[PDB]
Design a protein around this ligand. Structure first.
Ligand code: FAD
Ligand code: FAD
Lengths: 619, 621
């Protein structure tokens, strides 16, 4: 006894971008599926969110939505709202770095961001009509990374998939609902919910107050929550300007379309970004003088200056403009990202960078990811103040790093071009940071450097080599990690023979005891044991069975890859583990290395966990 | 009470390919890990292979190894031999099509073939120094397919990853062992009517093995094919390709992008990008007038002079010693039959040989092996009627006959030679460019493929669509992820939102299937089928309704068809398979992921005679 299915109602939203001589593209959308509460038949039926919530989220852009989704995966009750009546129809951010892709894949959303748009794996450089560079680029090593290159997947499409994931968890974005004010009882231990937020529905007029444990401010560049705190938002209004267009553009450019840069020392530079559906996005330098004037800079105006930059190649529109705008470059970074461990900024509320870098969605999503697993452990009370302090530190300084490299985006060998040689050297110094594999967290309570392995480094990306999860399934070591509420204890065990056998038996006895760090901080509620055995699956299952605690609570994985070279790379060599001493690597929930230890030193982790965690016991 | 871990002995095997002025690269290997029984201590300790196995495999090239790997998933007992003392050090095939990627992914080996080498997603075409074409190519659409483009993954890497997968299953390739002779008692009923006579050519020890079935993956000069009254026709063009893998420097504006460089005077060149900054260049070499072709005349250095004539005015020069070099003579042949009395089966180059240029050999070979192995497994289980191994023969032979035809069309212009050369290539790409990436592997009707109008798009004998779906509230993946294992058909029960008209029909089907005489139970139950209920609703809405059908929730697996409506921002499984929300559908998906048939929810009885067309009745447990 259920109603039949009805196909969702298409609406072709018109385009708000300035047109060209062909028009502005409309944008396909489905308001009932995508507009949250602001619709006639909501994708979640009879959605009745509570008045008391663990986390309230102001802002339902890419960063708020990611935060919503990571929390919902940990069982944290959540409400989220956004002032706009519908998600972004087109434009703004347009692609993801390899490391952003890794994040979605760890959340179970890898298929939604992969193979949406095109893939960028090459770069070109031209100067004054003459090709200088065409090369493979944006690469990650296959024996350490699944994803490589940049991936076109726009902000619209990211909002779509994240809204659909919230729906799958029976959560809707409340639109179009503004958070007008909020209170924080800084003074009151007895209280659980010292936050109240007044919400006003700009469609219907109804007000509301929610009480919440924690508040996440992800409301963009002009954040009211940031403005309400003793936080400053310093930066430099460069007053340099980009004209940006997204469209299908016919050209005789030999490399249509390839990521890269077209330099004219005469007329300034152009940046090419290939797009889905035979489109290209073109950034172009914009300078005006006889004060910067927005009035005479339309889509057709910049195509005229574009043809001057690509001489002798010429560009002509083949269809109506998909997107278009002028951007002012202002880079800003909040002095702090936390406040009293109750109000938390993430995304454009914390930092604003030039669009050119493409950091906002990428750095934003990685902010939400860093925040959400720490904030979630705060909701079940095992998080010491240090843990959420590491959020502010780790992501603020990464925001500062993004600011330095965007500034310098802008001594030569004799037979060499001055502006192209500083490009190859730029690509060399920051290339891996531009793809996310070199996001670098300095030492803190969570990142404890250790010489126990020669290569895996605290505060740095965990390496993702190929391993066998079973006899039949040969995938990636990331696939064995725990969920967002657990730390992954990588226990490298060699082939569990030689010297290490005794040490592993010791290790087994330490861990089973109720005073072990595993048991001391919650057992399987906060840890996932992975035993990495460099042996055949039959030799390993045999041997793992002699270790009663390891067999009974560990998940064995088979490190059966060929030795490190251009034909292989096992986890032991790629993490830098000694076959005599073993290792216990602590991978944080977000995939970054936390610390490491030898099998003998497994007791050193009691101190390491005490730095940011309170003791806990499994359920 | 276990010995400590010893790191594998590395050996740099010298190259046997002719050098350039800088030499010939050695090739990294690890004899104790990769050479099977023929090493000092094997990677499977005390491999004691039985003298009586279900299936014995002759040849451990990509095809034989793939066949072993599929059978070992199924619990078939297997012995696999190869005359050669080690696997391929370098060269021959260098890449996989998107559809071969899907085949590895279904076997659980997708991560071993992805991100091994480079990826080809673009084509260029030059003629007489002027560029004519530079575009995205080899695309598959993302709302239907995970992989797209060409993936560089060599025969060497493929053999590596398949040998390692056999080690995980405690199987070693028996090297360097030759099947000298074999007997097949057609007289008698015995379980094991095949005996194979084996000589190790290292130690001279002979041995006899008894098998239920024999697989001839022994290559182009298959001894097994010759023993059988099976013909191997085709034409030997004595057209010649010069092939060279090397790091090559060039001022070519597109170095290196897949494509073709034409020169009117000097013929043509095919480009293939490779890992580690190499490139593969095919170039035509033509025999002088009257005289036969003289291999003696063409080394790496000579080939490079022809390449610089073909690429004028851009020049090429070696930066490193040659990684690989050979002269292939194109000779395309197909066996008149691929099976023999459903006891000896051919797969790979023993069945068909192609122009390397087309890169058919390894991709079709893996797909043959895939096709063969699941049918052969049901034959070992007993449930296979002869009609099914018949479908192996005609599916793969016909596909081989198709593959020959498209390169016969390609190779006429290239040997011969608004621009009419580039025009014929654009049309050629538009016509076969998706069979060339494998999505148009197209099986004609037979017992296994019955066309059915119950759905608008899914089609018997064609590739099952792979749209995005949610497998849980937090895991949004692909529909292939729900499919059964290699000895199961996937019963894709499209159920709409389980509401309206269909609620009644689906309640009937629930009680139909639960009976011991429904097609599900009659042909094996969970031993032959997996049910997937594809609900176009939200997860908790779907979970609730599914609870109201007791057999479907008891025995089916719910996936959530929650993408946006089919467009450029989405595509639900219901729309991409062509299901009507009034009728529903039971799309039957074969083990290899080709569509078998479909019916409406009310026509569930129609599948009964479908499965009797090629299966014996079975009972779970
Ligand atoms: C015009 C423009 C162009 C851009 N171009 C690029 C680009 O080319 N490349 C790139 O990488 N990045 C670009 N960005 C940045 C990118 O859009 C953001 O970095 C990314 O969306 C992350 O921002 P966010 O999710 O934190 O918030 P945003 O998406 O900026 O906005 C957060 C949301 O909060 C809501 N909100 C604000 N105040 C309230 C309130 N009081 N109550 C309720 N809801 C509220 C807003 O409605 C908004 O939807 C651009 C941004 C803008 C504005
Ligand atoms: C020179 C050359 C170049 C090629 N180039 C390309 C290319 O560019 N692209 C492409 O896609 N394909 C190419 N191929 C084809 C590719 O090598 C084959 O398609 C692929 O190996 C599949 O063949 P197969 O596994 O069936 O047999 P193969 O790998 O060719 O050989 C089968 C195996 O059987 C073994 N064997 C033979 N007889 C016996 C016996 N009596 N007892 C035991 N073992 C035996 C052999 O030693 C060998 O290991 C090339 C092949 C060759 C020979």
């Amino acid at each position: 006894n259920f109603e039949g299915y009805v196909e969702p109602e298409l609406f072709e939203r018109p385009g708000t971008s300035l047109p060209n001589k062909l028009g502005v593209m409309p944008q396909l959308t489905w308001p009932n599926v995508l507009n949250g509460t602001n619709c006639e038949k909501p994708a979640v039926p009879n959605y009745k969110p509570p008045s008391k919530v663990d986390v309230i989220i102001i802002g339902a852009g890419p960063v708020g939505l990611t935060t919503a989704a990571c929390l919902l995966r940990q069982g944290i009750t959540v409400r989220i709202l956004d002032r706009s009546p519908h998600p972004l129809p087109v434009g703004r951010a347009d692609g993801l770095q390899p490391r952003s892709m890794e994040v979605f894949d760890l959340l179970g959303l890898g298929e939604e961001v992969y193979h949406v748009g095109i893939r960028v794996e090459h770069t070109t450089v031209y100067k004054d009509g003459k090709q200088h560079i065409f090369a493979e680029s944006h690469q990650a090593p296959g024996n350490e990374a699944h994803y490589t290159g940049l991936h076109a997947c726009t902000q619209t499409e990211v909002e779509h998939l994240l809204i659909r994931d919230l729906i799958r968890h029976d959560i809707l974005v409340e639109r179009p609902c503004t958070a007008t004010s909020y209170t924080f009882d800084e003074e009151a231990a007895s209280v659980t919910h010292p936050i109240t937020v007044n919400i006003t529905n700009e469609a219907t007029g109804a007000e509301e107050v929610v009480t919440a444990r924690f508040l996440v401010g992800s409301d963009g560049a002009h954040s009211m929550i940031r403005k309400s705190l003793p936080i400053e938002f310093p930066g430099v209004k460069t007053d340099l300007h980009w004209g940006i267009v997204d469209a299908v553009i016919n050209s005789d450019f030999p490399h249509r379309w390839t990521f890269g840069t077209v330099l004219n020392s005469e007329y300034g530079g152009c940046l090419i970004i290939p797009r889905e559906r035979n489109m290209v996005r073109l950034y172009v330098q914009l300078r005006a003088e006889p004060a910067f004037d927005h009035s005479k800079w339309g889509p057709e105006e910049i195509l005229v200056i574009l043809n001057k930059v690509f001489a002798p190649y010429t560009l002509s529109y083949a269809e109506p403009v998909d997107w278009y705008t002028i951007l002012t470059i202002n880079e800003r970074v909040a002095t702090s990202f936390t406040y009293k461990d109750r109000i938390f900024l993430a995304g454009d509320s914390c930092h604003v960078h030039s669009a050119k870098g493409a950091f906002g969605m990428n750095t934003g999503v990685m902010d939400a990811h860093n925040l959400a697993w720490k904030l979630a452990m705060l909701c079940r009370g095992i998080a010491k103040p240090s843990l959420l302090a590491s959020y502010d530190v780790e992501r603020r300084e990464n925001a500062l790093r993004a600011v330095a490299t965007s500034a310098r985006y802008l001594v030569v060998p004799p037979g060499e071009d001055k502006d192209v040689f500083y490009f190859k050297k730029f690509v060399g110094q920051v290339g891996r940071f531009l793809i996310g594999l070199d996001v670098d967290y300095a030492e803190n309570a969570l990142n404890k450097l250790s010489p126990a392995v020669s290569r895996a480094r605290a505060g740095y990306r965990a390496s993702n080599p190929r391993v066998a999860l079973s006899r039949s399934h040969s995938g990636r070591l990331y696939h064995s990690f725990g969920h967002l509420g657990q730390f992954t204890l990588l226990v490298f065990a060699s082939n569990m023979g030689g010297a290490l056998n005794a040490k592993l038996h010791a290790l087994d006895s330490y861990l089973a005891g109720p005073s072990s760090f595993y048991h001391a901080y919650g057992g399987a509620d906060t840890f996932k044991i992975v035993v990495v055995v460099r042996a055949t699956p039959s030799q390993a299952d045999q041997r793992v069975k002699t270790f009663p605690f390891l067999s009974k609570a560990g998940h064995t994985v088979y490190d059966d890859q060929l030795p490190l070279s251009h034909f292989g790379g096992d986890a032991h060599a790629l993490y830098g583990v000694s076959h005599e001493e073993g290792a216990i690597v602590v991978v944080r929930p977000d995939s970054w290395i936390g610390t490491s230890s030898t099998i003998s030193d497994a007791r050193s982790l009691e101190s390491y966990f005490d730095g940011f965690l309170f003791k806990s016991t499994e359920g």
